[PDB]
Structures are given as C-alpha cells and as structure tokens.
Design an enzyme around this catalytic site. Sequence first.
Site, PDB file in Angstrom:
ATOM      1  N   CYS A 112      -2.034   0.265 -13.427  1.00 48.79           N
ATOM      2  CA  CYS A 112      -2.121   0.332 -11.952  1.00 48.79           C
ATOM      3  C   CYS A 112      -3.364   1.210 -11.748  1.00 48.79           C
ATOM      4  O   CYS A 112      -4.355   1.030 -12.503  1.00 48.79           O
ATOM      5  CB  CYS A 112      -0.770   0.753 -11.365  1.00 48.79           C
ATOM      6  SG  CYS A 112      -0.027   2.207 -12.146  1.00 48.79           S
ATOM      7  N   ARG A 153       3.625   2.362 -10.829  1.00 48.02           N
ATOM      8  CA  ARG A 153       4.008   0.931 -10.894  1.00 48.02           C
ATOM      9  C   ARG A 153       4.072   0.468 -12.353  1.00 48.02           C
ATOM     10  O   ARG A 153       4.928  -0.376 -12.654  1.00 48.02           O
ATOM     11  CB  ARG A 153       3.031   0.063 -10.112  1.00 48.02           C
ATOM     12  CG  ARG A 153       2.960   0.424  -8.644  1.00 48.02           C
ATOM     13  CD  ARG A 153       1.849  -0.360  -7.987  1.00 48.02           C
ATOM     14  NE  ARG A 153       1.544   0.220  -6.704  1.00 48.02           N
ATOM     15  CZ  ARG A 153       0.535  -0.130  -5.914  1.00 48.02           C
ATOM     16  NH1 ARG A 153      -0.311  -1.076  -6.286  1.00 48.02           N
ATOM     17  NH2 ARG A 153       0.390   0.472  -4.735  1.00 48.02           N
ATOM     18  N   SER A 154       3.170   0.955 -13.198  1.00 43.81           N
ATOM     19  CA  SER A 154       3.090   0.595 -14.640  1.00 43.81           C
ATOM     20  C   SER A 154       4.393   1.019 -15.315  1.00 43.81           C
ATOM     21  O   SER A 154       4.950   0.266 -16.096  1.00 43.81           O
ATOM     22  CB  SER A 154       1.901   1.240 -15.289  1.00 43.81           C
ATOM     23  OG  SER A 154       0.671   0.723 -14.794  1.00 43.81           O
ATOM     24  N   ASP A 208       0.852  -1.220   0.000  1.00 43.79           N
ATOM     25  CA  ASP A 208       0.000   0.000   0.000  1.00 43.79           C
ATOM     26  C   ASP A 208       0.876   1.255   0.000  1.00 43.79           C
ATOM     27  O   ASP A 208       0.470   2.207  -0.649  1.00 43.79           O
ATOM     28  CB  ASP A 208      -0.936   0.045   1.210  1.00 43.79           C
ATOM     29  CG  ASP A 208      -2.294  -0.586   0.974  1.00 43.79           C
ATOM     30  OD1 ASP A 208      -2.354  -1.558   0.223  1.00 43.79           O
ATOM     31  OD2 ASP A 208      -3.283  -0.077   1.531  1.00 43.79           O
ATOM     32  N   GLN A 225       6.605   7.749 -10.348  1.00 45.64           N
ATOM     33  CA  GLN A 225       5.864   8.800  -9.591  1.00 45.64           C
ATOM     34  C   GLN A 225       6.726   9.339  -8.441  1.00 45.64           C
ATOM     35  O   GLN A 225       6.522  10.502  -8.057  1.00 45.64           O
ATOM     36  CB  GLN A 225       4.550   8.240  -9.035  1.00 45.64           C
ATOM     37  CG  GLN A 225       3.343   8.500  -9.923  1.00 45.64           C
ATOM     38  CD  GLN A 225       2.058   8.032  -9.284  1.00 45.64           C
ATOM     39  OE1 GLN A 225       1.893   6.856  -8.967  1.00 45.64           O
ATOM     40  NE2 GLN A 225       1.122   8.950  -9.096  1.00 45.64           N
TER      41      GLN A 225
END
EC number: 3.1.3.48
Length: 281
Positions: free
Chosen positions: A214, A220-221, A180, A261
Amino acid sequence: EMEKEFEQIDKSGSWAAIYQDIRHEASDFPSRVAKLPKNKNRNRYRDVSPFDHSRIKLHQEDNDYINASLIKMEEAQRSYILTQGPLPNTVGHFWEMVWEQKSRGVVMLNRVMEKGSLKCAQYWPQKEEKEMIFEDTNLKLTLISEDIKSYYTVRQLELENLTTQETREILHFHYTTWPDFGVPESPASFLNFLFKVRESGSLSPEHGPVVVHCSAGIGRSGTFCLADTCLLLMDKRKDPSSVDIKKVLLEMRKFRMGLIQTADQLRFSYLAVIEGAKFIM
Ligand SMILES: O=C(O)c1csc(-c2cccs2)n1
Ligand SMILES: O=C(O)c1csc(-c2cccs2)n1
C-alpha cells in the site's frame, strides 16, 4: 469462536481497547540498517522501518537496502513480502527485488493519488507500446495486457533481465476501490480480490513470495496477509475455531512493525475472515 468474539467487542465497542492490547504486546526488534543516513531517501516514512532480521536484501554490492520485509507463516506454508509504495528513486530497486525473489504476483492496495497526495510512484507502464527501462538495475518492463473490472484491475506485465535476456510473466493485481478514509463497508469485493490472487497461483509455494504494498506496507497490506493466512489455517486445522486472529496478527508483527494501523482495519479483518469462512465452511 471469533463470530461470537466479534459481537462481544462490537456490542461493547471495545475495538480501540483490543487494538491497544495488540499494540502493547507487539514485538520490537532492531531496524539499524533502515536508520543509516545513506538509506534516508529509500524510506517513504521515517517511522516505518523493516526489522534487520526479516528485511529483504537487494543482491547489489553497493547498497543492499529496500524497505521490504519477509513475513514467513510456518504453519500456513505462506510467505509474503510487504513493502512500501515505491519512491521515484526506488522503482528500479522494487523490480530488482521482484526479479531476485522469483515473485509471480504484485498486489497493490492503494491508488497512485489519494487525498490529493502521491501515495506511490507510477512503477508500471500505462500502454503496451511504451515500455519502461530501469537503467540503474538493468531491467525492462512491458505491459502485455490489462483487464479493468469494477473493484480491481489485473495487469499481465513481462520482466526482462537485460543482463541475461531472461524474461518472466508478472501478474499485477490492483485493488482500486479502497476508500480514501476508513475501510470498505462490506468485505465482499476484497474477498473476491483475494480469491482472484489465490487462483492465479501467485501465493503458491512453486513461486517466490508475493509482493504486497500500500503506501507504507503495514495497514491495508496487513489486512490482506492476515485474512489470507487465517482462512488457510481454518482449512488446515482439525478444529477451525482454534484460529485466533489476534495471535496470528502478533506472529506476523514479529516480521514487520505496525501491521493493521487502526481499530477499524482490525474490525474489517475480523469481518473479512468471518465472511470468508462461509465460502470455506
Ligand atoms: O517518478 C519516477 O521517477 C518514475 C516512475 S516510473 C520510473 C521509471 C521507469 C523506468 C526508468 S525510470 N520513474
Ligand atoms: O497470447 C498471450 O496472451 C501473450 C502474448 S505475449 C504474452 C506474454 C509475454 C510476457 C508475459 S505474458 N502473452
């Protein structure tokens, strides 16, 4: 060599500084179609838009918009479609795009619920006998089989075009253990996952581009595509050490904004590529 560059940024703790240089240098292109008022409910986040030049177009005459970008990595002969987690109102559009682009595989890097919020609609069936029909896009989706492992789940779905009765096998690769907050401690399970996607043929040029998502389709992608492309370039080049992650990331950022990110995702990307290179070298 990046391994040496890693210890340097790490020992100096310069990750936020490296990350900000990438932010500064990154391309910026119009995203006029994303910002049209008729498309406001097709976007999960208002600040995450596909560039007009690289956006996937739906073949529907009414509205051709989906929040999805084609990332073309010319030297690596790899293409990826990066998209947002579908919304309740775009699940039909998502499967239309999979159909129209002849994608073999869907890679999902998020859970449906994270931090007690919905990050994604439930866009695939949970049981063999309960198929989904997308009346808006005339597609039927059936769960054929499900193979649940510690770190990821592989699902064998079948897409049926109700307009033509053509059917296709789609592989759904669901990485279920991304924390998370922050990034995994070790890239081992992420690399295993990436090698499993490769082994399926889902990344091969015989097929349409893989669909990677994601929640926003940038964090994450981004890490997924960056690691895959960098490892492939180290196999293809005479000098593996000519592969500069930062350059690869900037080339990918011409196709979709915001890929990677956080400075943590950047550090993890280095770690995944460095570790992956040992299996490859
Ligand atoms: O949240 C929703 O609206 C949702 C998730 S999957 C789905 C549908 C599948 C097929 C028709 S609608 N809807
Ligand atoms: O024997 C199998 O593994 C099998 C039976 S039906 C089926 C599929 C349908 C559509 C995609 S995979 N596979």
